[PDB]
Design an enzyme around this catalytic site. Structure first.
Site, PDB file in Angstrom:
ATOM      1  N   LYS A  11      55.118 -12.405 -25.046  1.00 43.94           N
ATOM      2  CA  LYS A  11      56.503 -12.080 -24.704  1.00 43.94           C
ATOM      3  C   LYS A  11      56.601 -10.553 -24.468  1.00 43.94           C
ATOM      4  CE  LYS A  11      59.788 -14.127 -26.929  1.00 43.94           C
ATOM      5  NZ  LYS A  11      60.127 -14.674 -25.601  1.00 43.94           N
ATOM      6  N   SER A  31      49.524   3.866 -15.424  1.00 39.95           N
ATOM      7  CA  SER A  31      48.748   2.829 -16.134  1.00 39.95           C
ATOM      8  C   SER A  31      47.930   3.523 -17.221  1.00 39.95           C
ATOM      9  CB  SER A  31      47.882   2.127 -15.117  1.00 39.95           C
ATOM     10  OG  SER A  31      46.760   1.473 -15.711  1.00 39.95           O
ATOM     11  N   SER A  32      47.778   2.890 -18.364  1.00 38.62           N
ATOM     12  CA  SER A  32      46.895   3.389 -19.448  1.00 38.62           C
ATOM     13  C   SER A  32      45.436   3.065 -19.077  1.00 38.62           C
ATOM     14  CB  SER A  32      47.312   2.814 -20.765  1.00 38.62           C
ATOM     15  OG  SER A  32      47.139   1.407 -20.717  1.00 38.62           O
ATOM     16  N   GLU A  61      59.367   4.774 -25.569  1.00 37.34           N
ATOM     17  CA  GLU A  61      57.969   4.999 -25.959  1.00 37.34           C
ATOM     18  C   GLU A  61      57.096   5.387 -24.767  1.00 37.34           C
ATOM     19  OE1 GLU A  61      58.023   1.639 -29.553  1.00 37.34           O
ATOM     20  OE2 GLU A  61      56.549   1.558 -28.003  1.00 37.34           O
ATOM     21  N   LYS A  82      48.961 -14.317 -18.345  1.00 33.85           N
ATOM     22  CA  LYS A  82      49.673 -15.103 -19.376  1.00 33.85           C
ATOM     23  C   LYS A  82      50.739 -14.278 -20.087  1.00 33.85           C
ATOM     24  CE  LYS A  82      47.161 -18.492 -18.081  1.00 33.85           C
ATOM     25  NZ  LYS A  82      45.932 -17.757 -17.725  1.00 33.85           N
ATOM     26  N   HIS A  83      51.609 -13.663 -19.321  1.00 35.11           N
ATOM     27  CA  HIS A  83      52.774 -13.058 -19.985  1.00 35.11           C
ATOM     28  C   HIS A  83      54.080 -13.353 -19.291  1.00 35.11           C
ATOM     29  CE1 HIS A  83      51.356  -9.416 -17.952  1.00 35.11           C
ATOM     30  NE2 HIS A  83      50.394  -9.318 -18.759  1.00 35.11           N
ATOM     31  N   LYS A 125      49.850  -4.762  -9.347  1.00 35.23           N
ATOM     32  CA  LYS A 125      51.052  -5.227 -10.114  1.00 35.23           C
ATOM     33  C   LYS A 125      52.008  -5.934  -9.182  1.00 35.23           C
ATOM     34  CE  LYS A 125      50.560  -3.825 -14.495  1.00 35.23           C
ATOM     35  NZ  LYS A 125      49.209  -3.301 -14.713  1.00 35.23           N
TER      36      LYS A 125
HETATM   37  O1  LIG Z   1      49.024  -0.039 -22.133  1.00 33.71           O
HETATM   38  P1  LIG Z   1      50.331  -0.385 -21.464  1.00 33.71           P
HETATM   39  O2  LIG Z   1      51.560  -0.576 -22.391  1.00 33.71           O
HETATM   40  O3  LIG Z   1      50.698   0.346 -20.177  1.00 33.71           O
HETATM   41  O4  LIG Z   1      50.175  -1.872 -20.758  1.00 33.71           O
HETATM   42  C1  LIG Z   1      48.977  -2.682 -21.111  1.00 33.71           C
HETATM   43  C2  LIG Z   1      49.426  -3.963 -21.746  1.00 33.71           C
HETATM   44  O5  LIG Z   1      50.274  -3.760 -22.885  1.00 33.71           O
HETATM   45  P2  LIG Z   1      51.797  -4.158 -22.775  1.00 33.71           P
HETATM   46  O6  LIG Z   1      52.607  -3.277 -21.815  1.00 33.71           O
HETATM   47  O7  LIG Z   1      51.984  -5.625 -22.541  1.00 33.71           O
HETATM   48  O8  LIG Z   1      52.172  -3.924 -24.304  1.00 33.71           O
HETATM   49  P3  LIG Z   1      52.620  -2.587 -25.218  1.00 33.71           P
HETATM   50  O9  LIG Z   1      51.264  -2.200 -25.730  1.00 33.71           O
HETATM   51  O10 LIG Z   1      53.560  -3.238 -26.307  1.00 33.71           O
HETATM   52  O11 LIG Z   1      53.384  -1.712 -24.125  1.00 33.71           O
HETATM   53  C3  LIG Z   1      48.222  -4.776 -22.099  1.00 33.71           C
HETATM   54  O12 LIG Z   1      48.640  -6.038 -22.659  1.00 33.71           O
HETATM   55  P4  LIG Z   1      47.950  -6.769 -23.947  1.00 33.71           P
HETATM   56  O13 LIG Z   1      47.459  -8.029 -23.405  1.00 33.71           O
HETATM   57  O14 LIG Z   1      49.054  -7.045 -24.998  1.00 33.71           O
HETATM   58  O15 LIG Z   1      46.968  -5.718 -24.575  1.00 33.71           O
HETATM   59  C4  LIG Z   1      47.598  -5.139 -20.747  1.00 33.71           C
HETATM   60  O16 LIG Z   1      46.634  -6.083 -20.957  1.00 33.71           O
HETATM   61  P5  LIG Z   1      46.642  -7.667 -20.324  1.00 33.71           P
HETATM   62  O17 LIG Z   1      47.853  -8.540 -21.095  1.00 33.71           O
HETATM   63  O18 LIG Z   1      45.293  -8.049 -20.702  1.00 33.71           O
HETATM   64  O19 LIG Z   1      46.981  -7.599 -18.817  1.00 33.71           O
HETATM   65  C5  LIG Z   1      47.077  -3.905 -19.997  1.00 33.71           C
HETATM   66  O20 LIG Z   1      46.167  -3.235 -20.740  1.00 33.71           O
HETATM   67  C6  LIG Z   1      48.216  -2.998 -19.807  1.00 33.71           C
HETATM   68  O21 LIG Z   1      47.736  -1.802 -19.260  1.00 33.71           O
HETATM   69  P6  LIG Z   1      48.376  -1.073 -17.957  1.00 33.71           P
HETATM   70  O22 LIG Z   1      49.226  -2.062 -17.248  1.00 33.71           O
HETATM   71  O23 LIG Z   1      47.051  -0.832 -17.159  1.00 33.71           O
HETATM   72  O24 LIG Z   1      49.066   0.181 -18.479  1.00 33.71           O
HETATM   73  F   LIG Z   2      53.819  -0.641 -26.780  1.00 34.63           F
HETATM   74 MG   LIG Z   3      54.109   0.069 -24.911  1.00 32.48          MG
HETATM   75 MG   LIG Z   4      54.420  -2.070 -27.745  1.00 34.20          MG
END
Ligand SMILES: O=P(O)(O)O[C@@H]1[C@@H](OP(=O)(O)OP(=O)(O)O)[C@H](OP(=O)(O)O)[C@@H](OP(=O)(O)O)[C@@H](O)[C@H]1OP(=O)(O)O
Ligand SMILES: [F-]
Ligand SMILES: [Mg+2]
Ligand SMILES: [Mg+2]
Ligand SMILES: [Cl-]
Ligand SMILES: [Mg+2]
EC number: 3.6.1.52
Length: 134
Positions: A11, A31-32, A61, A82-83, A125
């Site tokens: 979610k 992007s991180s 944040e 899967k989100h 994206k």
């Molecule tokens: O690090 P963020 O917050 O910018 O976003 C990352 C997701 O983090 P997200 O923005 O959903 O969460 P938050 O860390 O709460 O912002 C992370 O999601 P996760 O699966 O939870 O590690 C996802 O992974 P994926 O689901 O495998 O595609 C990607 O790493 C994605 O990286 P980006 O889009 O390249 O910056």
């Molecule tokens: F986060």
């Molecule tokens: Mg975040």
């Molecule tokens: Mg977070």
């Protein structure tokens, strides 16, 4: 703590952070995984966290901004990853200097005209590009 819908989708919540009520310019963040790429700021809802609360929190944040929460645009699924993300409009009224991700990972932010935001999100994206379609 990541949270999930009953079908196992993560979610998430995000805001379209507009510069003004005219909704002509939107704030994207780096992007991180790949800092040369742009995304819509967003992230995971915490347990029992209201989607609109998660959205506002994540943008503070990740983008270092605050403002007036606006309407829910819709709920967007990323089948591949899967989100399921709730997307809200946020009219930015405060731009802060040393926000969590700037400090912690040197995350960048930039204003885009909507047509340009759609362009830079399309490749990696496409679902975030679709947030702008209506
Ligand atoms: O690090 P963020 O917050 O910018 O976003 C990352 C997701 O983090 P997200 O923005 O959903 O969460 P938050 O860390 O709460 O912002 C992370 O999601 P996760 O699966 O939870 O590690 C996802 O992974 P994926 O689901 O495998 O595609 C990607 O790493 C994605 O990286 P980006 O889009 O390249 O910056
Ligand atoms: F986060
Ligand atoms: Mg975040
Ligand atoms: Mg977070
Ligand atoms: Cl605007
Ligand atoms: Mg995130």
């Amino acid at each position: 703590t990541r949270t999930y819908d009953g079908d196992g989708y993560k979610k998430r919540a995000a805001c379209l952070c507009f510069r003004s009520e005219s909704e002509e310019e939107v704030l994207l963040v780096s992007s991180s995984r790949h800092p040369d790429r742009w995304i819509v700021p967003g992230g995971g809802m915490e347990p029992e966290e209201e989607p609109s609360v998660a959205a506002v929190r994540e943008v503070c944040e990740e983008a270092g901004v605050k403002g007036t929460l606006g309407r829910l645009v819709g709920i967007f699924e990323n089948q591949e990853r899967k989100h399921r993300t709730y997307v809200y409009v946020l009219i930015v009224t405060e731009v802060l200097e040393d926000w969590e991700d700037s400090v912690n990972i040197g995350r960048k932010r930039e204003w885009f005209k909507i047509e340009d935001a759609i362009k830079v999100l399309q490749y990696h994206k496409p679902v975030q590009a679709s947030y702008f379609e209506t």
